[PDB]
Amino acid sequence: MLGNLKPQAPDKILALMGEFGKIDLGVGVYKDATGHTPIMRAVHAAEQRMLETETTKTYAGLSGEPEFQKAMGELILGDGLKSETTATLATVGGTGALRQALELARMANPDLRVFVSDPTWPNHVSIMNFMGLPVQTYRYFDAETRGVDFEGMKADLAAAKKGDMVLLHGCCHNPTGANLTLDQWAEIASILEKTGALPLIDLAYQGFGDGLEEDAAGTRLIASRIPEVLIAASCSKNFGIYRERTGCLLALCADAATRELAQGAMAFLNRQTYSFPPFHGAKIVSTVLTTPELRADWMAELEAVRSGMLRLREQLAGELRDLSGSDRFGFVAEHRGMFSRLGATPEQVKRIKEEFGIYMVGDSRINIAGLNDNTIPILARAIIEVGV
Amino acid sequence: MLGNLKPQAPDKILALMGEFRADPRQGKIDLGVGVYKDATGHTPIMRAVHAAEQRMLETETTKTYAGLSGEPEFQKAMGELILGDGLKSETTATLATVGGTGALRQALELARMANPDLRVFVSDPTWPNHVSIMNFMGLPVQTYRYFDAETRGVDFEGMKADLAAAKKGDMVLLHGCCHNPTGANLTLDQWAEIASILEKTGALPLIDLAYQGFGDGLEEDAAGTRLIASRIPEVLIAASCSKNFGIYRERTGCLLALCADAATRELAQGAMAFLNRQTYSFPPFHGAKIVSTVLTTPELRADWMAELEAVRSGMLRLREQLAGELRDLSGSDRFGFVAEHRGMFSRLGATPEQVKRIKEEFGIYMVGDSRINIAGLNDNTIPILARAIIEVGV
Ligand SMILES: *Cc1c(COP(=O)(O)O)cnc(C)c1O
Ligand SMILES: *Cc1c(COP(=O)(O)O)cnc(C)c1O
Ligand SMILES: O=C(O)CCCCc1ccccc1
Ligand SMILES: O=C(O)CCCCc1ccccc1
């Protein structure tokens, strides 16, 4: 039977990792001055504390632990968290949350379609194709200005109908690095409540843009306006626990009844897929979030990380400017997050990796965290050489 | 939109515990638990597991994304733990999963990909979650006879007669050992006949191995699996580390796809990695790394096998004790099956109505299909359970 298995297409980023004076600017992970993805101080201390506190490993919560559910909701929605109308499900990372999100929605609407940003995280489309869900795209990135084509984005969203879902990146847009301003979010919230489109928000980098609270701004704004929203959150990057596989899905409902339904359907969704969700990472998160000392240090370390990358973008932007006189690559300093699409054509990007030894995703997505004072001028010179 | 969503029934475990906690009787007993509990009513963390967690705590330097289909240390160690020397790396595809359940679901996804018109035969009875996952996937589900309510043993003739109807490409689900919920298992000889039926029918076997080490031993419990693995070219195995390693909440397991040749292994392995990727991307590291540590570190592997064996001997003596008590109470050897059952579970063969009477009259709680958890017994509880059984006329 297994011989009928058709060969499946590889994931670009994972494959890029395969093809890797080498410069790793591919996969979206934070790296320090010495090319390492360290473990956060609070995370380590949490784990040490867990080693002493835990006395059992019996089956726990089917939808995650109360502490994880509550601490995550507060971190995301702040004071906009209305427990009585909010359903929470602990999942296997953000990706698990996204998949569970699409499953929940499709159960509620067998005829749903999903709009995604042009461009968006490749894995978004793969999951949707696999489930067989109709994918539509809304303009978002502006090829020329490297910013957001907001006039076009609004145009496309207006075509969304009731029952459709619109996937929005809460902050730090992957792969572009181009992000909406709170003013732009308020307008989208207007369109959404006119169309009736259910918004699904991919919150994977809360803390890498402008700050823990600031990066959650747009999400809090949508949640305040739209009576029903879905948020797929990830603790992989902002907590640096990538391999622990921890995130969660929040279902904001209009009332307690609808909320009770969702919560039930969410628990069931976990039961029929893998039973209980992974505990270790979730426990690290809540332990950090509910322990003032730990939370304080974590916030501090995350701030240091978000600050450093900001400094790097400026160095890089400057390096390029002085390397060409033109302030064309200014968009790099304007972008926010870990990625930024250089705009290099497919034929140019290949030159870079084969000759310059610098590996960046084929669509010119560079993980700014992969740069440093030593490699920045090299990258700058490298792309100047590649010209047009 | 979410208001449409149809009401999804609870996990039922909570309902079982619900009425139990509400019971105002100081001497109430709970044999409905689905986890191991030592003499003091606790589900302890195995010494080796705690040893592994400290070592990981001192040696892990990063938490970056690792293996999509799991880490090599885990895949190899697990395949060895299961298939022993019979492990053929060349034709074996492995996938780290989110517990045994994740393994079962991934196995069904993989199978359905290769054969859309797949049907699945499950035992009668079998782990409820089997049925629910299948129903949710929309797969056709057939049943083959298994438990014999009269002898509490395996109705093998019935099993064979029904399994004979399986067609080429159909999937037959087998519990490799310690059949949950029955406790009634196949002797190595019966396993050999099952293999014959499978070769004949061309059905693909899916073996659910969640209790390796809880029956007659690590190797002994893997016998049925190894027999099938050597005679059948394609076998799917969904292992669990939840119970035998005591890391339930860690969610550790794996799917092994035994193929007829390398080219096919490359096909299956690719499809498995794809299934992880499309469901939740990377699998959970912590538990799988605890496992590959105990298994590769001689000192720890030693202490783990010792602890598991102690637990095995312990539950086994409990069975002998319960059956001994039952013998003296009934004046017959009717309940001898309890000493012959293997695993932590056992279906007494009591009707739902007899089950209710026991609860009300004796304060003893158990699953509604009369499944009890051997680990819940002890020198004080056994005399009461024994008397209850006789008293309610089981
Ligand atoms: C990281 C990320 C996710 C989720 O990753 P997980 O490893 O599954 O936590 C989802 N979407 C985007 C855009 C991401 O960058
Ligand atoms: C426990 C169990 C499983 C798997 O459990 P996980 O906790 O998901 O690892 C599978 N089958 C049976 C029969 C079980 O008892
Ligand atoms: O680098 C990124 O795009 C962020 C996420 C990286 C991890 C990831 C890569 C491929 C598929 C799933 C998850
Ligand atoms: O059936 C049993 O009692 C053993 C497993 C019980 C807990 C469990 C419930 C759902 C999915 C996986 C595991």
CATH code of residue A217: 3.40.640.10
Q: Are residues A140 and A226 in the same domain?
A: yes
Q: Is residue A208 part of a domain?
A: yes
Angle at A67 between CA A61 and CA A68, to 5 degrees: 75
Q: Do A282 and A338 fall within a single domain?
A: no
User: Does residue B6 lie in a domain region?
Assistant: no
Rounded Cα–Cα distance for residues B390 and B229 (Å): 43
Sign of CA dihedral B376, B377, B379, B380: positive
Q: Which residues pair with residue B94 across a beta bridge?
A: B256
Amino acid at site B116:
P
DSSP code of B253? E
How far apart are alpha carbons A290 and A54 in whole angstroms?
16
Is residue B140 domain-resident?
yes
How many other CB atoms sit within 10 Å of the CB of residue A7? 10
A365 annotated to bind ligand? yes
Q: Which stretch of DSSP H or E encloses residue B373? A: strand B371-373
Query: Do A290 and A181 lie in a common domain?
Result: yes
Helix (H, G, I), strand (E, B) or coil at B148: strand
**Of A146, A92, A141, residue with least CA distance to A121:** A141
Atom of ligand 4 nearest to the CA of B180: 1
Contacts of A123 in chain B (CB under 8 A): 277, 281
Length of chain B: 394
Which residues make Cβ contacts (< 8 Å) with residue B263, sequence separation at least 6?
Answer: none
A261/A243 Cα distance (integer angstroms): 31
**Cα–Cα nearest to A90, from A284, A222, A302, A291:** A284
Pairing of strands B171-175, B29-30: unpaired
Residue type at B11 in one-letter notation: D
* Contact indicator for A251, A87 with CB cutoff of 8 Å: yes
φ and ψ at residue B99, rounded to 5 degrees? 70, 175
Query: What does residue A170 show for φ and ψ, rounded to 5 degrees?
Result: -55, -35
Q: State both tokens at A283.
A: 């426990």
Last residue of a domain, one of B264, B282, B312: B312
Q: Which of A273, A306, A339 is the endpoint of a domain?
A: A306
Say which residue the tokens 């016998």 belong to. B223
- CA distances to A157, A186, A261, A342 from A251, in Å: 22, 20, 10, 35
CB A107 within 8 A of CB A265: yes
Are both A264 and A173 inside the same structural domain?
yes
**Which domain CATH number covers B333?**
3.90.1150.10
Are residue B263 and residue B179 in the same domain, yes or no?
Answer: yes
Provide the β-strand partners of residue A23: A358
Query: Is A174 annotated for ligand binding?
Result: yes
Are B269 and B93 in contact by the 8 Å Cβ rule? The answer is yes
Q: What is the CA radius of gyration of chain A?
A: 21
Are B52 and B119 found together in one domain? Answer: yes
Joined tokens for residue A312: 């790097």
Q: Cα–Cα distance between A314 and A308 in angstroms, integer? A: 10
- Report whether A50 contacts A284 (CB < 8 A): yes
- Distance set, CA B179 to CA A118, B99, B138, B146 (Å): 51, 18, 25, 10
Cα separation values, B276 from A303, B178, B255, Å:
33, 28, 11
Distance separating alpha carbons of residues A376 and B310, to the nearest angstrom: 60
Q: Would you state the structure tokens that stand for residue A132, as one six-digit string?
A: 């067989």
Cα A119–A33–A22 angle (5° rounding)? 65
Phi and psi for A132 in degrees, rounded to 5? 80, 20
Give a yes or no: residue B2 inside a domain. Answer: no
Torsion sign across C-alpha atoms B259, B124, B8, A82: negative
Q: Which residues contact B332 (CB under 8 A, 6 or more apart)?
A: none
Beta bridge partners of B143: B122
The residues near B325 (Cβ < 8 Å, ≥ 6 apart) are: B382, B383, B386
DSSP states along B329-368: HHSSSGGGHHHH--SSEEE----HHHHHHHHHHH-EE--T
Q: Which residue has the tokens 């010179």?
A: A381
Mutate to test the interface with A, among B55, B286, B291, B292 (most CBs of A within 10 A): B286
**Of A306, A330, A350, which residue is a domain's last?**
A306
Residue B239's DSSP bridge partners are B209, B254
Q: Which residue blocks in B202-258 are alpha helix, DSSP H?
A: 218-231
Residues B112, B241, single domain; the answer is: yes
Q: Which B residues 144-173 touch A at CB under 8 Å?
A: 169
Give dist(CA B336, CA B328) in Å, integer. 11
Two structure tokens written together for A364? 């010119």
In a domain, B4, yes or no: no
Tokens read off for A267: 């628990």
Same domain, residue pair A152 and A104: yes
List, in sequence order, every residue forming a beta bridge with A247; answer none if it has no partner: A91, A234
- How was this structure obtained? X-ray
By the 8 A CB rule, do A29 and A38 touch?
A: no
From A243, A280, A286, select the one nearest A95 (Cα to Cα).
A243
Written as six digits, the tokens of A193 are 């409540």
Contact list, B9 vs chain A (CB under 8 Å):
264, 268
Is-contact B362 B8, C-beta < 8 A?
Answer: no
B44 Rama sector, left if φ>0, alpha if ψ -120 to 50, beta otherwise: beta
Q: Pairing state of beta strands B252-258 and B92-98?
A: antiparallel
Q: Is A28 annotated as a binding residue?
A: yes
Nearest ligand to the C-alpha atom of residue B106: 2
What tokens does A34 get? 């010495």
Residue B298 tokens read as 């001689």
d(CA A121, CA A141): 13
Distances in whole angstroms, Cα of residue B353 to Cα of each of A230, B124, B359:
45, 20, 10
* Token pair in block for residue A344: 């290099």
Which sign does the torsion angle of CA A320, A325, A326, A331 carry?
positive
Question: Considering CB atoms only, which of A7, A228, A261 is closest to B270?
Answer: A7
B121 and B200: one domain?
yes
Q: How many domains does chain B have?
A: 2
Counting ligand 4 atoms within 8 A of each CB, the residue from B11, B104, B129 with the most, and so the one to mutate, is B129
B153 belongs to a structural domain: yes
Residues A316 and A233 in one domain: no
Q: Are A73 and A86 in contact (CB under 8 A)?
A: yes
Buried b vs exposed e over A342-363: b needs ≥16 C-beta within 10 Å? bbbeeebbebbbeebebbbbeb
- DSSP H or E segment with residue A200: strand A198-203
DSSP designation for B166: -
B contacts of A276 (beta carbons < 8 Å): 99, 248-249, 251
Best residue among B101, B365, B369 to mutate for probing ligand 4's pocket (most ligand atoms within 8 Å of CB) is B101
Q: Is residue A5 part of a domain?
A: no
* Catalytic residue ranges of A: 121, 202, 204, 237
Cβ pair A234, A94 in contact under 8 A:
yes
Torsion angle in degrees (nearest 10) through CA of B210, B214, B220, B225: -10
CA pair distance B148, B134, nearest whole angstrom: 24
Question: Among all chains, which residue has been given the structure tokens 């968006």?
Answer: A120
- Same domain assignment for residues B112 and B222: yes
Q: Distance (Å, rounded) from C-alpha A63 to C-alpha A270?
A: 7
Helix (H, G, I), strand (E, B) or coil at B64: coil
Main-chain dihedrals φ then ψ at residue B176, nearest 5 degrees? -60, -30
Query: What does the DSSP 8-state code read for residue B216?
Result: S
Measuring CA to CA, which residue among B103, B109, B135, B106 is closest to residue B122?
A: B135
Q: What stretches of B115-212 show up as alpha helix (H) in DSSP?
A: 128-137, 156-163, 188-201
Residue B126 Cβ contacting ligand 4 at under 6 Å: no
- The helix/strand/coil state of A368 is helix
Secondary structure percentages of chain B, helix, strand, coil, to 5: 50, 15, 35
Parent domain of A368: 11-38+307-387
Which residue(s) pair with A77 in the sheet?
none
Q: DSSP of B88-106, one letter per residue?
A: -GGGEEEEEEEHHHHHHHH
DSSP string, A264-324: HHHHHHHHTTTSSPP-HHHHHHHHHHT-HHHHHHHHHHHHHHHHHHHHHHHHHHHHHHHTT
The dihedrals phi and psi of B379, each to the nearest 5 degrees, come to -55, -20
Q: How far is the CA of B354 from the centre of ligand 3 (A)?
A: 55
Token representation of residue A10: 């590889």
Question: CB of A330 within 8 A of CB of A317?
Answer: yes
Same domain, A78 and A177: yes
Contact A88, A275 (CB under 8 A): no
Short-list B5, B18, B12, CA closest to A259: B5
- A6 lies in some domain: no
CB atoms within 10 A of CB B150: 8
Characterize B267-299 residue by residue with b for buried, 16 or more Cβ atoms within 10 angstroms of its Cβ, and e for exposed.
Answer: bbbbbbbbbbbbbbbbbbbbbbbbbbbbbebee
